[PDB]
């Protein structure tokens, strides 16, 4: 019904999740994973938008390690006061519990984290911004995405899970608070998403995972007849030199190990240890300016060879976003 792990949980996250307070997991309902299984998180500052009971906040906590930091934001006392419960519990995980926790919880609206109350979230403080089945619920999406842009460091990354549509919803369906409350009503047409995040400073969206979402309950399915709701997990890097098109300047880039046998960046790129792999300029700028430069040697720009076609799905790479997400999902 939208808000439920609409894919399997990744392996590494399971080991952890076992150890997460069961209360936090009874409650909790987002479409799939909003946190990489890269291994790329040690020492990061992660912010969660609409964190609720803090499932993702506490999973991030273990992932970042004792010396990274997590900040869940949520608008509701009732959701926050549940997650605050287990700060100390989950400090066992770091051995020295009642003291060793990274996490903290701010109360505020995600469209404005500068007024989040315990304390605000200043400009350029965050490495990763996550969210699990929450952004579809915003009222001013452009405002939200700009806000996210204000708060990431340069080379930082919006990496998040949310529910998206085949097509714009009818004027009617927009209004229905039942539909909206099931995290379907507010969901975005994939092409309007891309348009917005770009309007807001993110010109390069990359799709990690797509999930079938089905309304079944036909009291709803009437207002959205031919719609096909999705659950997509998207990374958008904050990097000033990205263009809206994946141009090719001759560069390869090579994963050096440190994490696993291979680093998998998106559906299109998989760098295994010490094997160079050709990339478009954006993909290079991402690696260079993000936290990734440390596991990554990256060739120099050369001559422009027009649109990047060095990939075996290059056709699709350049396709609209709707088409990308029909083809994966089939
Ligand atoms: N405009 C807004 N500002 C801040 N938080 C919001 C919001 N609209 C909805 N939320 C929060 O969004 C959450 C949707 S439920 C998802 C909670 C969490 N991501 C999980 O998977 O458990 C709720 O906890 C709600 O409090
Ligand atoms: As939801």
Task: Give the arrangement of secondary structure elements.
Elements: H1 11-18, H2 22-26, E1 45-49, H3 55-64, E2 69-74, H4 77-85, H5 87-91, E3 105-107, E4 126-130, H6 141-151, E5 152-165, H7 171-175, H8 177-181, E6 188-189, H9 190-199, E7 205-212, H10 218-221, E8 230-237, E9 252-255, E10 262-264, E11 270-272, E12 277-278, H11 281-289, E13 296-298, H12 314-317, H13 321-327
Parallel strand pairs: 1-2, 1-4, 2-3, 4-5, 5-6
Antiparallel strand pairs: 5-8, 7-8, 9-12, 9-13, 10-11
The protein binds S-adenosyl-L-homocysteine (SAH) and arsenic.
Structure notes:
This protein folds into 2 domains: 1-244, Vaccinia Virus protein VP39 (Rossmann fold), CATH 3.40.50.150; 245-330, Ribosomal Protein L9, domain 1. It contains 13 helices and 13 strands. It starts with 10 loop residues before the first helix and ends with a helix. Strand 1, helix 3 (55-64) and strand 2 form a beta-alpha-beta unit. Strands 1, 2, 3, 4, 5, 6, 7 and 8 form an 8-stranded mixed beta sheet that branches. By secondary structure, it is of the alpha/beta class. The structure holds S-adenosyl-L-homocysteine and arsenic. S-adenosyl-L-homocysteine binds next to loops. The PDB classes it as transferase.
